[PDB]
Write a protein that binds this ligand. Structure first.
Ligand code: HEM
Ligand code: HEM
Ligand SMILES: Cc1cc(N)nc(COc2cccc(CNCCc3cccc(F)c3)c2)c1
Ligand SMILES: Cc1cc(N)nc(COc2cccc(CNCCc3cccc(F)c3)c2)c1
Ligand SMILES: C[C@H](O)[C@H](O)[C@H]1CNc2nc(N)[nH]c(=O)c2N1
Ligand SMILES: C[C@H](O)[C@H](O)[C@H]1CNc2nc(N)[nH]c(=O)c2N1
Ligand SMILES: [Zn+2]
Lengths: 407, 411
């Protein structure tokens, strides 16, 4: 019930107590571990609300004060009356920061307290969402000097009035299936790209076309907007040694901005809460560029390097993979767009894990996602035992809206 | 119940019913996943159910379930347990049980090979000298001049737990680690503690960077005894790189035969506390872990120096670059000397075929993703994108405490 985690490289042992405050379930049981699975009324609301406010007032050192009891009372009164409630700005900021702090799959949580929170709870239309989002992108991009931020649209009500950003990221490239048989652009995005075409977008049918936004306000049908081109910072990818590399025509965008998740604070559900930081290099180089299901460019690079592709045991893939990742980091650094490498990112998370054990009693972490997708065991997270559990406030997955939308 | 696992690269979806035959526990709950934790006398009472369940599994596999032979064997084991309190496995059951422990080893990426396992029955062994001889024969048979063959040797089972057979070495072949007064380590830092035990017991340590450790063998609960593996029995490979001629001058080598000697083999409630087994290496086990862990040989700096990589910032990926070069060297050397080795691409692709096949013919394949995924280039190997259910089946291999923590010394 009081759990220990060992780091097998440093022998440092930490004691986890925070896990007892765990509320949601994992997918696992005593009989079966589901660690590698990608996706495992008035009644319930007040307990959820109280649980939250209790932690909030405890965090500001006013646990059991009149202000505390007053708010508890106040919120209770509002739920009984309105069947929901509203968070104070302070509570909203705190909630959102803590959903980040609690995301057990995020290697970048050392940063969790520097989140700029944009309260867009007054937004009513999809045009308004477009305005808030452009402001978010522009603030976050900060001419390549990236700052973390989240924009929070209004909370879910009866659930027929949801705000949704239909894009999975604010900034993503299109994907088109061709008669050709193969896929042009980003294969991860074919379906959503078809929804954009079938809502009216005129696709340029390039390899790297920035998707338009599909914004849904107040449960209405979603609308298309294009992010001003001048707000979408992009980096052309060159290698610091291979002159030919830039001839591959690769670019990526600078701003990672997840837009399809659901933020739950104190029982309240914010179904549109796009949030952003800055990239860890491997996210682009390893996954975006080299995944079979993605841009899949390893063969093309190995070829240009003239490696023996005859046998897997020449490790031509591994070699091409590293060079692609050197190129990503190099291109971003050259243009002064913030980026972190996996060595530096994971070292940061180990320091952060340690701060959270000594300051909070632990840190939920999901090893499967924390350990980078290349060079695993030469980063310190690999040797680090982690405990995975769910705390609230949290970010959660929600069904793609096209599967849900009453048209 | 039916459980599904998706492959996110191929969209292949599999269905597992085998997890329903699981008994042992995971250490996870509905509130906490312990999937990345490294290490999460029996009585007549528990014994017969465990025996019966094993023998039902056995008798099904040979299509004799419910036969008279089946029933008489249950009868016979029942009796033996009641009067003698344990029981003896037949050779064929022993063989089946050891194959199955391997098959059920959820952290093993090499299970495609599970049915080709030479079983050596050393249950007539009585002394440490007897153990030595069995182990030498194992090592010589498994090595097979570089054309490695899987094998296991199985010494007598636990009785009162006061008479255990144990191999104190953690692998049969392993390099001495020596702690220096200055605080640095000579040889393999993983094996420092055990090297001290060997020295304390009378080994004359050559004190090099690559000294093959002597065996420390306990028979029948007696104090362990020391023996040297005949050097001519120990196949080693000097490590060179195909383009980098300076690689050989690093002075690296490694042994050909990976042979785990510190696990417990549980079959039908019986506990085989000495059961050394050996296979062949996946390159990354030597090239990533043994050479480049900071707690092991730790040769990354030195390799990247010689390659003259920009070592000022980690974002040049100098570590990653050197790691690949070392791993190429390891595979290249073993291939050049005709010592069996598999690369991590080939190994993980074979496992995915094995795993699918196991889903078709067996109803599942317990797998531990934290362990199956290789320690380099994770995401470009097909296992990375494979969802996997982890659970425990018997027969099984288990950890057991190091014998120096538990042995009652006689003197
Ligand atoms: C500041 C730089 C940041 C870095 C380097 C970073 C890093 C990452 C990485 C590498 C992942 C792995 C998932 C994948 O491979 O796609 C991840 C997951 C995640 N991060 Fe971050 N992160 C950052 C900022 C943020 C921010 C600002 C938030 C939210 C406020 C956030 C919330 C998440 C969540 C919710 C997940 C996982 C979603 C899930 O459960 O599957 N991160 N992060
Ligand atoms: C055929 C060659 C084999 C290869 C390439 C292979 C590969 C591996 C690798 C890479 C691991 C991960 C452990 C680590 O990285 O330290 C492993 C684990 C294991 N393998 Fe194998 N294996 C082979 C044969 C065998 C054999 C013959 C057995 C026994 C019959 C066996 C039983 C195990 C067990 C028990 C584990 C996991 C230890 C644990 O639970 O922590 N393997 N295998
Ligand atoms: C804010 C931020 C910064 C940064 N450097 N990296 C990130 C990456 O975080 C996320 C968060 C949510 C989702 C994703 C995309 N990754 C896989 C999600 C997923 C789940 C289930 C099914 C899928 F097809 C895909 C990535 C986020
Ligand atoms: C038979 C065989 C072939 C092959 N290629 N590789 C192996 C490696 O498998 C094992 C099996 C058991 C133990 C080990 C040693 N490493 C993990 C055990 C362990 C536990 C706790 C802490 C550690 F540092 C190490 C490795 C075994
Ligand atoms: C099957 C497995 O859960 C899946 O491939 C995971 C593994 N680890 C990951 N880790 C990160 N950071 N991102 C991912 O998308 C995945 N995919
Ligand atoms: C803490 C973590 O579980 C530990 O480092 C594990 C991770 N995965 C591993 N995977 C393999 N194959 N071998 C190992 O020793 C480890 N170590
Ligand atoms: Zn689990």
């Amino acid at each position: 019930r009081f759990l220990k985690v060992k780091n097998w490289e440093t022998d440092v042992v930490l004691t986890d107590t925070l896990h007892l405050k765990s509320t949601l379930e994992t997918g696992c049981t005593e009989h079966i571990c589901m660690g590698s699975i990608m996706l495992p009324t008035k009644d319930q609301l007040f307990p959820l609300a109280k649980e939250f406010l209790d932690q909030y007032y405890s965090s500001i050192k006013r646990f059991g004060s009149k202000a505390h009891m007053d708010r508890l009372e106040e919120v209770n009164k509002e739920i009984e009356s309105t069947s929901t409630y509203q968070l104070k700005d302070t509570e909203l900021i705190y909630g959102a920061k803590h959903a980040w702090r609690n995301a057990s799959r995020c290697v970048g949580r050392i940063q969790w307290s520097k989140l700029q929170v944009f309260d867009a709870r007054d937004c009513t239309t999809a045009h308004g969402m477009f305005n808030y989002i452009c402001n978010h992108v522009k603030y976050a991009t900060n001419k390549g000097n990236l700052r973390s931020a989240i924009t929070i649209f209004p909370q879910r009500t009866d659930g027929k009035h949801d705000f949704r950003v239909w894009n999975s990221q604010l900034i993503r490239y299109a994907g088109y299936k061709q008669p050709d048989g193969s896929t042009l652009g980003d294969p991860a995005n074919v379906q959503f790209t078809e929804i954009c075409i079938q809502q009216g977008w005129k696709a340029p049918r390039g390899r790297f076309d920035v998707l338009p936004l599909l914004l849904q306000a107040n449960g209405n049908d979603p609308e298309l907007f294009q992010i001003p081109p001048e707000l979408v910072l992009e980096v052309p990818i060159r290698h610091p040694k291979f002159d030919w590399f830039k001839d591959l025509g690769l670019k990526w965008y600078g701003l990672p901005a997840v837009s399809n998740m659901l933020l739950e604070i104190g029982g309240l559900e914010f179904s549109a809460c796009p949030f952003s930081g800055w990239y860890m290099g491997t996210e682009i180089g390893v996954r975006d560029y080299c995944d079979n299901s993605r841009y899949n460019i390893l063969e093309e690079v190995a070829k240009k390097m003239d490696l023996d592709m005859r046998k897997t045991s020449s490790l031509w893939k591994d070699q091409a993979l590293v060079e692609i990742n050197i190129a990503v980091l190099y291109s971003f650094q050259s243009d002064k767009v913030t980026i972190v490498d996996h060595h530096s990112a994971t070292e940061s998370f180990i320091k952060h894990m340690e701060n959270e054990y000594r300051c909070r009693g632990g840190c939920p972490a999901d090893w499967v996602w924390i350990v980078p997708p290349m060079s695993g065991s030469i980063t310190p997270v690999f040797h680090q035992e982690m405990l995975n559990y769910r705390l609230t406030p949290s970010f959660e997955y929600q069904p793609d809206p096209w599967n849900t939308h009453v048209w």
